[PDB]
Fold:
Amino acid sequence: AVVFLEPQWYRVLEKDSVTLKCQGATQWFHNESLISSQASSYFIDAATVDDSGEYRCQTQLSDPVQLEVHIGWLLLQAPRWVFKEEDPIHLRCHSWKNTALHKVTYLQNGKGRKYFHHNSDFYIPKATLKDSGSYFCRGLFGSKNVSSETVQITITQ
Amino acid sequence: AGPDVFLFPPKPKDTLMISRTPEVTCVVVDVSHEDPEVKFNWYVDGVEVHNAKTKPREEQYNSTYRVVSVLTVLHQDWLNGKEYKCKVSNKALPLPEEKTISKAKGQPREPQVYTLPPSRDELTKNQVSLTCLVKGFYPSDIAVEWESNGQPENNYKTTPPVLDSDGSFFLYSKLTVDKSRWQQGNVFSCSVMHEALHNHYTQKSLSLS
Amino acid sequence: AGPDVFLFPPKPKDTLMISRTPEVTCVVVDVSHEDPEVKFNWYVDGVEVHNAKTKPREEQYNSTYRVVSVLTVLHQDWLNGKEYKCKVSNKALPLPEEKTISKAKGQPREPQVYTLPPSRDELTKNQVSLTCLVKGFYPSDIAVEWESNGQPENNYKTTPPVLDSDGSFFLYSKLTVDKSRWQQGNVFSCSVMHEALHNHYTQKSLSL
Ligand SMILES: *[C@@H]1O[C@H](CO[C@H]2O[C@@H](C)[C@@H](O)[C@@H](O)[C@@H]2O)[C@@H](O[C@@H]2O[C@H](CO)[C@@H](O[C@@H]3O[C@H](CO[C@H]4O[C@H](CO)[C@@H](O)[C@H](O)[C@@H]4O[C@@H]4O[C@H](CO)[C@@H](O[C@@H]5O[C@H](CO)[C@H](O)[C@H](O)[C@H]5O)[C@H](O)[C@H]4NC(C)=O)[C@@H](O)[C@H](O[C@H]4O[C@H](CO)[C@@H](O)[C@H](O)[C@@H]4O[C@@H]4O[C@H](CO)[C@@H](O)[C@H](O)[C@H]4NC(C)=O)[C@@H]3O)[C@H](O)[C@H]2NC(C)=O)[C@H](O)[C@H]1NC(C)=O
Ligand SMILES: *[C@@H]1O[C@H](CO)[C@@H](O[C@@H]2O[C@H](CO)[C@@H](O[C@@H]3O[C@H](CO[C@H]4O[C@H](CO)[C@@H](O)[C@H](O)[C@@H]4O[C@@H]4O[C@H](CO)[C@@H](O[C@@H]5O[C@H](CO)[C@H](O)[C@H](O)[C@H]5O)[C@H](O)[C@H]4NC(C)=O)[C@@H](O)[C@H](O[C@H]4O[C@H](CO)[C@@H](O)[C@H](O)[C@@H]4O[C@@H]4O[C@H](CO)[C@@H](O)[C@H](O)[C@H]4NC(C)=O)[C@@H]3O)[C@H](O)[C@H]2NC(C)=O)[C@H](O)[C@H]1NC(C)=O
Ligand SMILES: *[C@@H]1O[C@H](CO)[C@@H](O)[C@H](O)[C@H]1NC(C)=O
Ligand SMILES: *[C@@H]1O[C@H](CO)[C@@H](O)[C@H](O)[C@H]1NC(C)=O
Structure:
């Protein structure tokens, strides 16, 4: 039985809508505590630092799935920080309250790797070695120039 | 959303001196590949004009193309107050972006120019300073240069125009030479070009008495 | 999604001369009526202080508030370069807004001062100019004034500091009098306050 996120993103900002679906062919746990829900899937109205830590599920018939509630304007979201070459890399410059962003720039090692007029996701269609490094997105919130927290990427073997 | 547009004016020297050719530059920034073709329409006094040379998108450091259009302007066109407008069409701008630019409005005033020698106190130093004071001019747009017996001297800096208490502007240009250069009695000249001077030029000379 | 925060430094007079009281001004702007409560946390070299005074909110003209806190800084707590941080908490912004300000980083350099009389050419007019040349100083912050036999003159404007070709800054102060005085002939003196001078002060005078 494997817990399954939706959106998968294990990294989220506050005021984000997180879902946790439990899969079998319900009772829950947070930080090894009992989730109120019985239903076949549990819902987070609005993310808060409280809801961090491990999450498990047990249908009548699991190994943890982590959650990070970061805080700020922008959050660079990728399914993982490690890929091996010829692997699609999908990044997402997620904004606080899905705010309409514009003039979005993804970067690496302090270097503009791509740009958009409106908030669009970054794809590196197949992962080279020269790709791994130090990333963060930045855009415009209202009239405010903001930037996301940094993440480390790694391509191996 | 962009692209952002900036429009620039002729440097004054080009406008003032007949030998040179002035031009107005329309600069466009932040352009995506998804929307990289850019159109320019240029207007003088509201009548469209055709004679601008658009340069190639030069892609930037940050993943953005950069485009530029240049217009070639007549001297008595610009000094007469004409409005220059640039209209940029693009497939990311919902409505084209017009930016216009023109000469500074107001009666011109002919600058009085004065050259000032080094302070006696200064001599004690390796190098002395030579000052050109230009005051009394409107508009801010002026050009100031230095030369020594014909070559352009290359160690002078000029302070940006300062709004005077009387509505005119002023500036100071400091040229730095070697005291040795100074004592011999070399001749130094501060050269001023502004729209309010005959021939759009005047010269004032500074050497020892 | 606001409000913005701009954080200003002290004017140099306040920092240079003991007598006065220098202060960094942390002004918060674009504060919405829906989210008007605004908290300030002040830090000096990373350590918090609470001797700051948040002023009465001033509603602005675009139908948005404007707020201001001032921190009073010890005179040498700035000349030594300590970073002053101003953390604005509010519910329009997901994360408090920190801004920082500090001294111009870099070795100080002694301003050289020189007083220049009018040109033989300018004497031919109803009013002549007196020039004070201040060159060779770092950092940019400086103060320049004119006086007449000790008292404050009222007819001078000052050029912005200009980066010299040797890493230094320089500027020009143009004092204007009537012709008569120069020949009066009265002593005038341009006075300069900067961190690289003895007692943070020096004076250069001009007569016939
Ligand atoms: C992606 O990267 C882009 C490029 O990056 C580079 O540039 C730097 C960042 C560098 O660090 C590297 O990263 C890389 O090199 C980047 O684009 C940038 O976007 C900025 C934001 O829009 C632009 O800022 C504007 O700059 C204007 C000034 O431009 C001049 O000065 C800059 C700085 O030196 C210079 O780079 C420009 O080239 C330009 O120089 C002039 O250029 C003209 C044309 O070539 C020359 O003239 C011609 O010269 C020929 C010579 O052959 C001949 O003589 C012709 O006759 C002559 O016409 C000049 O010689 C040359 N002059 C000089 C001194 O170099 C600013 O005016 C503008 O400011 C205004 O707008 C601001 C808000 O946007 C506002 O805050 C500000 O107050 C101001 O406001 C206006 O305010 C006025 C009064 O204050 C009012 O009067 C107005 O009404 C008001 N108007 C408006 C609309 O508000 C602005 O700051 C920047 O130029 C641009 N950089 C480049 C290289 O294009 C992009 O942002 C990046 N994207 C992302 C997402 O990060
Ligand atoms: C709704 O209506 C609002 C109301 O009017 C409006 O508010 C304005 O918002 C503007 C932003 O949109 C904001 O603009 C900023 O202005 C900064 C300078 O402001 C000073 O000068 C202005 C004149 O040009 C004044 O109007 C301002 O009030 C302010 O005046 C200064 O005030 C301080 C403290 O009050 C004072 O200091 C104290 O003085 C006393 C004297 O009694 C003592 O001496 C004390 O010891 C001393 O502490 C100053 O003397 C006084 N100065 C003057 C000249 O009077 C300007 O700096 C900002 O620019 C920066 O940011 C922009 C980005 O937006 C950059 O493009 C720009 O490059 C600047 O970035 C700085 O660059 C530096 C390098 O040069 C760098 O070092 C900095 O790090 C960098 N800073 C940043 C943050 O990046 C900016 O233009 C304006 O001030 C607001 N008006 C007021 C009155 O506050 C609001 O926007 C409206 N909203 C809408 C939606 O319409
Ligand atoms: C669970 O642990 C996380 C840290 O991993 C904490 O942020 C959160 O507040 C805790 N929640 C509960 C209900 O204990
Ligand atoms: C963002 O702010 C940064 C400041 O470093 C600057 O590089 C960039 O031009 C600004 N604009 C956008 C749209 O990212």
Notes: The helical segments of chain C are 12-16, 76-79, 179-182. Residues 150 and 189 of chain C are 8 Å apart (CA to CA). The first strand of chain C starts at residue 4 and ends at 8.
